[PDB]
Amino acid sequence: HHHHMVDEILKLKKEKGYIILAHNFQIPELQDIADFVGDSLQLARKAMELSEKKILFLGVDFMAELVKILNPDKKVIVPDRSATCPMANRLTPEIIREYREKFPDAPVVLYVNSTSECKTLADVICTSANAVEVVKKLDSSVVIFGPDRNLGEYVAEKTGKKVITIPENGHCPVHQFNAESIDAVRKKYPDAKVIVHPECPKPVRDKADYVGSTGQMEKIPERDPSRIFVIGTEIGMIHKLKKKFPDREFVPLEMAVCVNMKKNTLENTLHALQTESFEVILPKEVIEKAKKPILRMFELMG
Ligand SMILES: N=C(C(=O)O)[C@H](C[C@H](O)C=O)C(=O)O
Ligand code: SF4
Ligand SMILES: [Cl-]
Ligand SMILES: [Cl-]
């Protein structure tokens, strides 16, 4: 059944020379057939190291495109071409240009969860792990930041800089946990450590033991010996964490599912390898323009 699809996927990936890259929010069945599972930038950087020239990418479109931007001569395919990030998609070129006009001395800092077109208009890209450091290192004490207001506000708190968030009410619906869920797990597991994403709202961040990216979450049990961790992010990370640390318990803060990440299935992944579709193609000019603020990020962090 799934053994058939899994076996055929493994067979076709080897036969056709594909490396499979899966985001942390993919279903467990897809994480387990991937060569590498990680966050968007981790995956794009990993691809840069590969001898293979064909990639099957399992995530959402801005991430596949990030891989393509940094690996332009590889064929990058995705099983569901509609898999997208609604938060990214709410920020537009028009809004970025309006805000640059109003605040022409403010660098435009765009979270990696952003469309590739929007990236072409950014001064620097950031990830949830490096946003604070990126913004600290910028000359300016004021920045334009999008598309996530929560991450922006977190960055403001940590840097003491003024962060002008765009678009209005930009947020990830998946990470809108209730702070009351933390109150409830504290009572239920008094010794658990609560780790939440910086995309979570402030009251959730402030009640957590740790705030971090998924990449940061998976490093925490290397330094914290706690038996139980409660996890405030998308449900896919539970599988990732439990696989890496089988000796610990990982409890979801709440059940939170990214419908777009769940568009990828064993069946459409198999179809993708059978047909070698759908190729992620960006105009040359988009790749060249979007590369500029990505390199600026690498420079700042180096
Ligand atoms: N912040 C992320 C993460 O995986 O921690 C995002 C992905 C996700 O869509 C955010 O909620 C990324 O991979 O860059
Ligand atoms: S979890 Fe949130 S930020 Fe990530 S792809 Fe889904 S809607 Fe976008
Ligand atoms: Cl390349
Ligand atoms: Cl600068």
Q: What is the largest CA-CA distance in the chain?
A: 58
Burial class (CB in 10 A: 0-12, 13-18, 19+), 189: middle
> How many C-beta neighbours within 10 Å does residue 281 have?
11
Domain count, the chain: 3
Q: Give the technique used to solve this structure.
A: X-ray
127, 154, 216, 258, best to mutate for ligand 1 pocket (most atoms within 8 Å of CB): 127
Domain shared by 41 and 113, yes or no: no
Domain shared by 14 and 74, yes or no: yes
84, 85, 259, 263, best to mutate for ligand 2 pocket (most atoms within 8 Å of CB): 85
82 carries a ligand binding annotation: no
Q: Whose atoms come closest to the Cα of 52: which ligand?
A: 3
147 carries a ligand binding annotation: no
How far apart (Å, rounded) are the C-alpha atoms in residues 137 and 27?
A: 37
Cα 139 to the center of its chain, rounded Å: 26
Q: Which of 265, 269, 277 is nearest to 9 (CA)?
A: 269
| Token digits of residue 74 | 């590889």
Domain shared by 139 and 128, yes or no: yes
Q: Which domain holds residue 224?
A: 172-255
113 carries a ligand binding annotation: yes
Q: Of 136, 171, 206, which residue is a domain's last?
A: 171
Residue 301 lies in a domain: no
Residue 147 lies in a domain: yes
Residue 239 lies in a domain: yes
Domain shared by 4 and 73, yes or no: yes
CATH of the domain at 237: 3.40.50.10800
Domain shared by 37 and 18, yes or no: yes
Residue 298 lies in a domain: no
Residues in the chain: 302
Residue 302 lies in a domain: no
Beta bridge partners of 54: 18, 75
